[PDB]
Amino acid sequence: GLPLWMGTFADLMSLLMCFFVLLLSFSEMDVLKFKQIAGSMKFAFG
Amino acid sequence: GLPLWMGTFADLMSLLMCFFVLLLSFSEMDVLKFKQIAGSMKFAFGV
Amino acid sequence: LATLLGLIGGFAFVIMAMVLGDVTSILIVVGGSIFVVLMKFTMGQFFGATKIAGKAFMFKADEPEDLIAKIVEMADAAINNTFMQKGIDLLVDGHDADVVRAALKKDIALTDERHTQGTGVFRAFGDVAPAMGMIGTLVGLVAMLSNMDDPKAIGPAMAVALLTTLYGAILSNMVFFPIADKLSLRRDQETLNRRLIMDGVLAIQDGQNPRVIDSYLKNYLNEGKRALEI
């Protein structure tokens, strides 16, 4: 199988995902920064 | 032991979670949305 | 209280199935799972496993009580079941004890092997479903990252990709693994039934006392997972 530290790591990461989704749910993204990030990501992926 | 795919799952979660941290790098807190978020959380948890 | 537990189980399965139902997301998971499984089992064996699962989920096993009653009523005297009819025909045709024992034990081992193969196929499906769901989720993540246009379309789009992972989990813990577990339970039940038929047929052919064979049948009844029912 896998070591149990992997399970603890997965649970902690899912918990932090939930918390960060909550944090972002009441935050506004800068449109210019998001456009720059989108362009860089599109260039990186082909 | 644990399921063999759990590793990837942890990876995936971390991946996504880090992306959200990136999405929070250029974010701007909105007080009003926080207000109804807190109200909804209080209503949902039965308080 | 039994009705309450049955209702809660049915309601849980219904709500989880409605969460399952939404077309492509399940399709990637099932296609990947099938492709990975076919490296271990030929399509004929997979279809045989599905046949066995259907027969186990649609036809109830014959309870040991009616089998014991029928065996003892033939013993005092001297039918819908298949194996018992075959054994009865085998002894009435006229044969030694050893050949009948060998034939019925071969049939029992064949049933055990078939049920074990079905259990193995569905356990392989359960093992490989979440990994393929995760692969589908990662491909969806790549697509959404390569089509980054609107911030308000980040939430839902990601929620679609992650959806695939969910399906894998729902297919792994609520479909394939439960079917494997039910197949194992059906294998144990059918092994017990066939062993009881073995004992009864051997006693009838050997002309043993019906009382001792009745005690033997009760003793075989009082063992196994049934021990909790007493």
Next chain:
Amino acid sequence: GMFVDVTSILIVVGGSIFVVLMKFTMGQFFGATKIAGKAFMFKADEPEDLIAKIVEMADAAINNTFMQKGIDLLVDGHDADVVRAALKKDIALTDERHTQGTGVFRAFGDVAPAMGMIGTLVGLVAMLSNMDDPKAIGPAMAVALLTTLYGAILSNMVFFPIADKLSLRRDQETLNRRLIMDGVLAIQDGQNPRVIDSYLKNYLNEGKRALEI
């Protein structure tokens, strides 16, 4: 308010019950529940009292069902073979019954966290999909967190400890039944009380009980 609590409870408990009911029949589950109840309110008869009772009968020649069965069989069955076989059958039946109960509760314990993770994923998908309605992400995170917490609590504090306590009770019952077996066999053989009392001493320090000394 109540909706998210019942949704989380439905996911976790209903999924666990559905999977176990596919695994174990309903009557067997109720038998396991009865076993757990009888093993959580009734303290096991400690072996020292059993040794005292056994040496009392040995010197001479209630409050224990197995001892009553053994003495009833001894009064009727003169040969030691039938008594030994029947009591070993009872010992094996009790062992298998407790093992099946432990298996049921451990099956619950393994199934529950998977349902907790599934509920977490459902809540996460709902939160990501809405992400804009305040009245739609509160319930989603309520479901996610409550399913994870209920899965963890039921797996590590309700079902696994009950299974472990059932295993402890099976060990204690096996020791008690074995001591009764030795007592009845000695009284059938007419053994001296002192030699059997010395013999049981190493039986006391078997396994877990070796830590106390």
Next chain:
Amino acid sequence: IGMFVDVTSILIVVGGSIFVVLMKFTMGQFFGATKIAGKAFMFKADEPEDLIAKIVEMADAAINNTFMQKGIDLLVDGHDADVVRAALKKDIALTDERHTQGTGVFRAFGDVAPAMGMIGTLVGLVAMLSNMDDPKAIGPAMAVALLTTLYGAILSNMVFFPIADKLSLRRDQETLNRRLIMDGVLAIQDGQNPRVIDSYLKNYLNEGKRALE
């Protein structure tokens, strides 16, 4: 940079897996495992029914498969049953050992690949989070992390593990075929009737995974 990220992800995953496996297995062992996997994939194993028919044909009379040719040569060389049986068992053990080692090699590959995916993910995520204020720098880092995780998952679940179970299934088929050939050779040397040995060999048709009727 678009192809550079793909090259970097492939380098991380495949190079890490190769290095870790090479530390575990001899490099010629890796060649042997690759060759046996290629043979087990490109070629179809002889049907046991065909082997049974051929064996009963020679039994009545008293060869493309090499093991059958070796058995026939041993039988015609005027050797006793013990030496022929020992040689056939040694060949069967050698084949089983080769297939087990190949399965082990590919299982090691499939176990190491997700770990390299995790390492690449962590490297890419650190590169992103450290270069937060550089829009031109998080694209490649995110792409490396995501693609290395996806490649680890794909290689582990679709390329290496299924090859391992395919090698295990081919080991089962090879062992069954070689055992059938050995049994047929022993029956021919003993001199039994064609019908009884035909029935005995057809009894093997329902062994293991072949129950598909």
Next chain:
Amino acid sequence: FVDVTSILIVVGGSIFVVLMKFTMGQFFGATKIAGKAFMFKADEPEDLIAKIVEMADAAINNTFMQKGIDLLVDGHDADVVRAALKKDIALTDERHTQGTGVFRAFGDVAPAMGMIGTLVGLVAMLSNMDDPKAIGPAMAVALLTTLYGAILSNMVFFPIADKLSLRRDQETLNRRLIMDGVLAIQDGQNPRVIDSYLKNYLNEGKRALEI
């Protein structure tokens, strides 16, 4: 960081689960054996070999050696003393196995209790959200529970179990050496041959690397 509530939650949950598994007396005996195997040191095998050679030349500090000598004084055959020593060795081995098992149970249970405490803390903070600036630090203390479990699952309980198993190996080696010495003494063998036989044990499954 330091939090009394978090460590109390982790230790209380772990103790409750283990007391469901083991009994209170067995847990206290496990703590006693851990203290005895930590604050004390096992006698060097070379010292025991020299001690047995000294008695071989003459014809007593360790309790097992004293017991063997006492059973040797009162004219006892090889079988009875061998059975008594084997019984004592098996009892000590099983006691150490029980201690290893209970500390393994503690190590396996602690992180789950940490995760449960973290989830409860997060639920409380979510149900009592008042100030945005306190959404960060609050979960911090919640995470303090999880970290604690991790530490207790990797720095205390698992190392204690491993040390207990190592001490079990050391004690079974020492008692096997004492058994061989008593057997040689009752056999009246030469000091040199038994010295070589005892020195053959100096390269056991853990002491070979010091060479």
Next chain:
Amino acid sequence: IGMFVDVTSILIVVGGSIFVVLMKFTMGQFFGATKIAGKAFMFKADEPEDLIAKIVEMADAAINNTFMQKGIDLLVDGHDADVVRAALKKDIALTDERHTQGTGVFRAFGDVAPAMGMIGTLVGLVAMLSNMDDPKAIGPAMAVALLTTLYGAILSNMVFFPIADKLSLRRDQETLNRRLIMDGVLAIQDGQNPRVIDSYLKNYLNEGKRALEI
């Protein structure tokens, strides 16, 4: 780059792993295991074919490997065949156990490192969350925790586990060569012709791992 180096993180990982391993291994045992790993990495195991050639070349006459050097020295000492067999078997078993315990030490290190990395990233996450007013300047505060996790993963997967696997491989090769040398010295003491022993020597060269080569 400086974003992948952190003194506190590597300190946490290495100190925790060393402290946990020292609970079950003495410092002398750890140094012995490190010496084993260094010797097995820097020196190459002698080819079995070369050893067979050297044995058959020295058979008719009546030096690199120390095992055969001690064998020929003991042969000059003229000990009994039982003494030769006992001493050679004892040396082979001692080397086998030494390599096995070196592998055990390195596997303990490899199994302990990622858990310490997880502890370190938990500490990093707590430190980051205790100093967050807005989720803006939490990039490097997450990078350091992920750095601890990456250190743990790298040390577990590419440094310690490969060393344990290489130690196991070297143990197998050393056992094979030791068995060949023991058989050769036994044959030389017996005085048989060089050719007869070679007939049965080469049957079992491809044992286990080497079974794939044919």
